Amino acid sequence: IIKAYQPKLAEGNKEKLGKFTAVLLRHIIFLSNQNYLKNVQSFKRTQNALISILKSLSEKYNRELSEECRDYINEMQARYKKNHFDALSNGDLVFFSIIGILFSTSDQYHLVITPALILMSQFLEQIKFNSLKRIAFGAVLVRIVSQYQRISKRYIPEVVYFFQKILLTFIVKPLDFENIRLDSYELGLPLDVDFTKKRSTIIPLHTLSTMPVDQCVSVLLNVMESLDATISTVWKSLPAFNEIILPIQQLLSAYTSKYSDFEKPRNILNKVEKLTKFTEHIPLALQNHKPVS
Amino acid sequence: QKALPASLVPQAPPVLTSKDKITKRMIVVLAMASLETHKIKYVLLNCDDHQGLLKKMGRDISEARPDITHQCLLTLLDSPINKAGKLQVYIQTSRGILIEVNPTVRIPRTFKRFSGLMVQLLHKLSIRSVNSEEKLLKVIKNPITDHLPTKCRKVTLSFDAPVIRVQDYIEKLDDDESICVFVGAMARGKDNFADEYVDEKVGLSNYPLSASVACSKFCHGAEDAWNIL
Amino acid sequence: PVLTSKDKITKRMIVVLAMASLETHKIKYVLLNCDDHQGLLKKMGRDISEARPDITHQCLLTLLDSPINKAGKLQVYIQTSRGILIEVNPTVRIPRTFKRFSGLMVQLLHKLSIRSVEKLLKVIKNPITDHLPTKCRKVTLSFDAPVIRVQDYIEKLDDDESICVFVGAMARGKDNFADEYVDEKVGLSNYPLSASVACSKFCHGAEDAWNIL
Amino acid sequence: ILLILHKRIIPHFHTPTKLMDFLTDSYNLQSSNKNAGVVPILALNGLFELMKRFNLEYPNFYMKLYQIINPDLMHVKYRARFFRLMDVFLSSTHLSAHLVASFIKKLARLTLESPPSAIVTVIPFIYNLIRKHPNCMIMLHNPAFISNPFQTPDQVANLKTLKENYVDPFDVHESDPELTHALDSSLWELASLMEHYHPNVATLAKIFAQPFKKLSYNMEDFLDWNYDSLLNAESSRKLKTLPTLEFEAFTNVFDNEGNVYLPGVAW
Amino acid sequence: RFKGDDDIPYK
RNA sequence: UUGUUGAUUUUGUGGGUGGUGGUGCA
Secondary structure (H helix, E strand, O other): OOHHHOOOOOOOOHHHHHHHHHHHHHHHHHHHHHOOOHHHHOOOOOOOOHHHHHHHHHHHHHHHHHHHHHHHHHHHHHHHHHHHHHOOOHHHHHHHHHHHEEEEEOOOOOOOOOHHHHHHHHHHHOOOOOOOHHHHHHHHHHHHHHHHHOOOEEEHHHHEEEEEEEEOOOOOOOOOOOOOOOOOOOOOOOOOOOOOOOOOEEEHHHHHOOOHHHHHHHHHHHHHHHHHHHHHHHOOOOOHHHHHHHHHHHHHHHHHHOOOOHHHHHHHHHHHHHHHOOOOOOOOOOOOOOOOO | OOOOOOOOOOOOOOOOOOOOOOOEEEEEEEEOOOOOOEEEOEEEEEOOOOOHHHHHHHHOOOOOOHHHHHHHHHHHHOOHHOOOEEEEEEEEOOOOEEEEOOOOOOOOOOHHHOOOOHHHHHHEEEEEOOOOOEEEEEEEEOHHHOOOOOOOOEEEEEEOOOOOHHHHHHHHOOOOEEEEEEEEOOOOOOOOOOOOOOEEEEEOOOOOOOHHHHHHHHHHHHHHHHOOO | OOOOOOOOOOOOEEEEEEOOOEEEEEEEEEEEOOOOOOOHHHHOOHHHHHHHOHHHHHHHHHHHHHHHHHHEEEEEEEEOOOOOOEEOOOOOOOOOHHEEEHHHHHHHHHEEEEOOOOEEEEEEEOHHHHOOOEEEEEEHHHHHOOOHHHHHHHHHHOOEEEEEEEEEEOOOOOOOOOOOOOOOEEEEEOOOOOOOHHHHHHHHHHHEEEEEO | HHHHHHHHHHHHOOOOOHHHHHHHHHOOOOOOOOHHHHHHHHHHHHHHHHHHHHHOOOOHHHHHHHHHHHHHHHHHHOOOHHHHHHHOOOOOOOOOOOHHHHHHHHHHHHHHHOOOHHEEEEEEEHHHHHHHHHHHOOOOEOOHOOOOOOOOOHHHHHHHHHHOOOOOOOOOOOOOOOHHHHHHOOOOOHHOOOEEEEEHHHHHOOOOOOOOOOOOOOOOHHOOOOOHHHHHHOOOOOOOOOOEOOOOOOOOEEOOOOOEEEEEOOO | OOOOOOOOOOO
């Protein structure tokens, strides 16, 4: 299609192909919505190729892509208003990721990154996260937003709120955390779970639409690893790191107490204790103004 | 461990004026300034630009250099102490004209424009702001003492006088009092221009100092002594 | 001894007047000035705001007349905005009337140097780094940078190393002219400083720090 | 009943003071039922009406009021009604410095785990409270810990030893705002909110570092915000511009089940 | 507001 | 497409260069 309608062949081919930067993106998202568990390897081959083609198309028709991308943002929000999580699918996660691929994430203002970050933050808070599918969707959402701020390292409060509720969800309350608002008390992990076997922390997207204990643990560990990365990158720089980690530290202490073998919180707790020790906690000095002439 | 004041916002310090005699300040007197005008239009007599005219006047053109005054006032007025509002400049022209320099003024840095200001000031006896709210440069009646603060220490720059540390003298001097410095903008001459007013003369360095350098040298010590930064 | 670029061991206070606006134009060659030549520079299309070499004159005057220069512990370098680097012999004594300074500069730029009977003012090859002492600390004057005490700063630095300060004689612009060579930028005074005043302030600290007197 | 008590019930009673026990019980209600947790907020309006009319004192009002402020308050729909009452209560001329300091500290303690809309709500509120009580302005800025350029070396050493030994004295579990020792603490949360992902929220957070020239901020201009407003605002951008693309290239967007832009998310 | 080494305007 | 001419230009897409430059040397 691109060859048959290159800019040189005829007038208006530039205007057309810009729309095919938009149409290709929709096709990319549509393919992700389609089932591909049968031929994941083939889907991987075709998918990355299409994204590469869109990257070249975006380089010359970035304007048309942004219009389509934002229109998709307007569409998901409207679908979220009436359907809530049912509107959200794998492709919505894929759209958020491809935006990160093609658009400058580390910007104070951006036409497409900013609405995506706001829209995703709305999911991280508004969505009930009352099912392992829903928790799995949130975990992928946390990973995507973390990659957006991989250089900027800005603070997302919704990431803290999402972490706190999910951590308490898998321990259900302990009667010590009434400030955290849970939406499902039936997802508590059983005590008999080993927490010593080597469990892959990767969450397939095709299993998401289909959606036992092991799957819950893998989702937890992925959420645990994202939490550790957030502590290691963004939270440490913030002046209030000690406070930001207190609710998590108490949650992490509960994880160790209930599951002594389960090592990840002890690791995170050790790094947290390590970082708190260096971090110099000062009474802030912020009203220091420059004398005037 | 202390609660912060009611209002921390920095406010511009009151602009010091001759009427106010209580506040501590560092006064600098640029004595023996060579500022003269003559109709050719009235032009500030200059050492290099005009040579024959000053010969016709009979004045030794060696002492016909206002650029020294221009630089000294430039180095002075741009000093942080002015920006802190703790300095007032007085200019005593060789003819006997006393000029008060409001700390708010800003002389043009270009010498040619500076000459235009001086001829404007000398003939109109005053210079008004662009916004027309205050008279930045005003000629005032002699003697100098009446304008100076009631309690003030007077000193001149004397190369023959003992060499001192400008910082040290300012701390041992009392607080409510003010310090007045008489600097000779003359290219050369005897350091007796301010003898009748001053009480004691000091030298600042073993080696000879330019008037602009000495003026800049003195103010830096005061800023160090008074923590003006 | 008179300090020179060849000698690198001795401690000294190096000052570089970066972005110096010195330029010669013939209608005969004469130094361009913001006031003397306006319509000509308007025809060039350059703004007369950045046509002001007297800052280099004033800064060079205060630096040259400072006690440190008399004590033989200071050398001056000037980096013209056009890219011309000038070495200033500490022994020199420039004219103080701006008109005679301009006539000297056009002589310096066109003959590439000045000899009066060593070369008083000599145009040297860039970069600055080769000319500067082998062990030397580099800083610029930056208003946004933290305010530091020049006396305390010089005291805390070592003895064998030398100090470079990069001062902007330019009228307006970003303080990045010497970012490539410098390792850190420091603030001298809490308030905005003119180039001459900052140069006057800095040599005060070295004189106090080294007891030059 | 509590919603209409202040308007349609209290004025029609001969001795409305008799409602004090019911409102007091309503104001002190603590239940494990989440939906019953909003009862004290509604009862506060009627309780204040009784105190205002007959000059009644509820025992330990501001201790109980400090207790009520909680994460659920920022999310419930009656937040606007509550804050309107807060402006009346916290306009009193006799409130102690430790009192207001605890409320600011706990609200800042909450804004960390709050939505931006709630953050947009609180940040003006803390500005107004601090401006009302300049003694609490120490919380934003404690001067003794400044490193002043002219401070002598012994002062630097004393600051360093004082620096090392400092500990935050604010108590989160203490229910008495005059005992929380908040006035001796400081607001690190607002400085962390300065790095908020949303630029406008960060700008509102940057205001504290700027001087407090403004006398007060209109609460009505900041209460009504939410996720939809931010999304709706971006849905209608008056100006449209080409986006800045990534120069970096990732071979695969997602992880497998070369370069992966989402490790841990299988494809 | 003029700052530093600015010269007064020339008309 | 040209001031009557005929593929020299015109439209769209990509695209490099200071260059009838000056000046000092052998």
